[PDB]
Amino acid sequence: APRVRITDSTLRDGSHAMAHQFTEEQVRATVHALDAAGVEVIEVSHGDGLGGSSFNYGFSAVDEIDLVAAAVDEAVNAKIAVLLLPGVGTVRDLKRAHDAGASVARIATHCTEADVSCQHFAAARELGMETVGFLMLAHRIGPEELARQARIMVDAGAQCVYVVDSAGALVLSDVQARVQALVREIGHEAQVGFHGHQNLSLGVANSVLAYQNGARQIDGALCALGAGAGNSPTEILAATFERLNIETGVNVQAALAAAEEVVRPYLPRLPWADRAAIVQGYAGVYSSFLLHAERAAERYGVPAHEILQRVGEAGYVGGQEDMIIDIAVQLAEE
């Protein structure tokens, strides 16, 4: 069976769950454990990518590039990836991550907006970085439309394009259809990936189905650490692909020990599909809105799940955290 490459995003998507308060020691310990377990690519950035530190998303406690540098220093065999969102992070930020030793650039746009990334893919390829495109909130458009946007990324220099279930809103055949459309369009020259969230407890199944329909890159995080109810757990992906006799190169016992012994002790709380997270999956809300909605819930004295329901009704895209406050004010007046 063709092998699948797992990218771990404990230290990037998981940054959302940590409110970007990772310490250098946590980054090093996590990188050490993942690398030794055979994980091939380890993503390290602010949750909203390079340049994400802000009032809108929250500031990283430690300088963003210092954490990337620490990850690169700790890594022995793993590549360090960084995430960049055009409109937030820039080519100058990418150059600073390359200077720190990152070797994989993952460049994310809303699913309908691939053409804003063409400069970033060009710069990443010029720097000798492996490139991955991310089409965020991929449930928002159909497979055909998604494949056209993937084609734009590949023409710009993307070596892989992911179907990204940012809201944890996709259900099984929805993933199949999107992955197959991308495989049909770009598969002869680029890889296809999938990144799932746990808001409906479907991340792992969606990942398996994505692989079975031609995806060769899959994301997870240790202990599900990530936005919303979390990401597909790296340790479960490793165990499940092994049961399916699909090679990942990740040692299952080492992945289980990394989750249990290294990551679990620093979790602020367990990733969990509570009412608020399930509403995100049901209504198609960007997962990283969760802790911002909880903060506004407390500040305005309204329920976080009602904030998120309203956000869902409105159709906001990644990065629109400011809209949470407007909604919370409205709800408090109501």
Binding site: S54, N56, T112, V116, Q320, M323, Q330
Partner: protein, 295 residues
């Protein structure tokens, strides 16, 4: 000055044609010329429909005319304005640049235009800058602002190829102008494209770091006054709610803040109301034009 300045518009596209409509309404600007390079231009056709002399023979043709304009507004590209700017200067035509060329000082009308009223060429910054810099200045004129950040959310259909090809430059130029025009010590600008249908009305959020003991009544009054000022040239520029104040948090590196939530509805001149980014640019450029004419 009570008279009308004679104007040309160079670049008869989305911005140029919207500006044409606005200027035909202006108290103090008479559009005499619409200048492009494509004979089949929609903007040239609209100008001829509205009685304005139109030419696809470019700046060469404009500078040949017996009666040169007092003002030229340029909405072409950075490279085109870099080429044309010295020609306007040598002909003594004052230029308002709506492109990224930025040969002249960056201006925002209710903020810093007064110190540049005698300039031969002024630049309009960025569309998001025109929406948000007034608010950064409204805060920084009351209290020191160590850091100001703006988040611009625009309808995808209002982002043209120039916008899309040059997204990093929006973040960079706007952040720099937040600092040099807005008066913040440090700036950041984020832009988001949202494809919702029907197309969304532009939103802009402005966050300013402020002292914990700031007089928030005074800050609000200043913001309200600025919003009213901007509203006199962009009537759909509104506060979505009162400014929101929050004391320091560790997620904000110990900064206290004010957050201002704007909705920017276009006038629906040439462009639809969801094209608030283009509309504020042309409204601000027309206002700069009127202040230059009146000075």
């Amino acid at each position: 000055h009570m008279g009308k300045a004679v104007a040309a518009i160079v670049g008869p596209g989305n911005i140029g044609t919207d500006l044409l409509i606005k200027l035909q309404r202006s108290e103090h600007i008479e559009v005499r010329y619409m200048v492009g390079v494509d004979p089949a231009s929609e903007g040239l056709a609209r100008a001829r429909k509205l009685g304005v002399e139109a030419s696809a023979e470019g700046v060469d043709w404009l500078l040949e005319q017996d009666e040169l304009p007092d003002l030229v507004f340029e909405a072409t590209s950075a490279k085109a304005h870099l080429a044309n700017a010295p020609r306007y200067a040598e002909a003594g035509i004052t230029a308002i640049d709506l492109t990224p060329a930025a040969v002249g000082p960056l201006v925002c009308p209710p903020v810093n235009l007064t110190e540049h009223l005698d300039a031969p060429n002024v630049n309009m910054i960025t569309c998001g800058g025109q929406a948000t810099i007034p608010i950064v200045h409204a805060v920084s004129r009351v209290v020191p602002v160590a850091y100001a950040e703006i988040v611009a959310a625009i309808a995808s259909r209002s982002a043209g190829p120039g916008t899309r090809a040059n997204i990093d430059e929006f973040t960079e130029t706007t952040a720099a102008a937040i600092e040099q025009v807005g008066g913040a010590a440090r700036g950041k600008a984020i832009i988001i494209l949202n494809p919702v249908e029907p197309p969304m009305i532009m939103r802009d959020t402005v966050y300013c770091a402020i002292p914990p003991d700031a007089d928030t009544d005074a800050i609000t009054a200043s913001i309200e006054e600025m919003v009213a000022e901007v509203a006199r040239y962009v009537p759909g520029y509104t506060l979505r709610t009162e400014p929101q104040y929050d004391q320091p948090r560790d997620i904000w590196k110990g900064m206290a803040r004010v957050a201002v939530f704007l909705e920017v509805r276009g006038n629906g001149d040439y462009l639809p109301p969801w094209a608030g980014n283009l509309d504020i640019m042309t409204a601000a450029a027309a206002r700069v034009g009127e202040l230059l004419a009146q000075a």
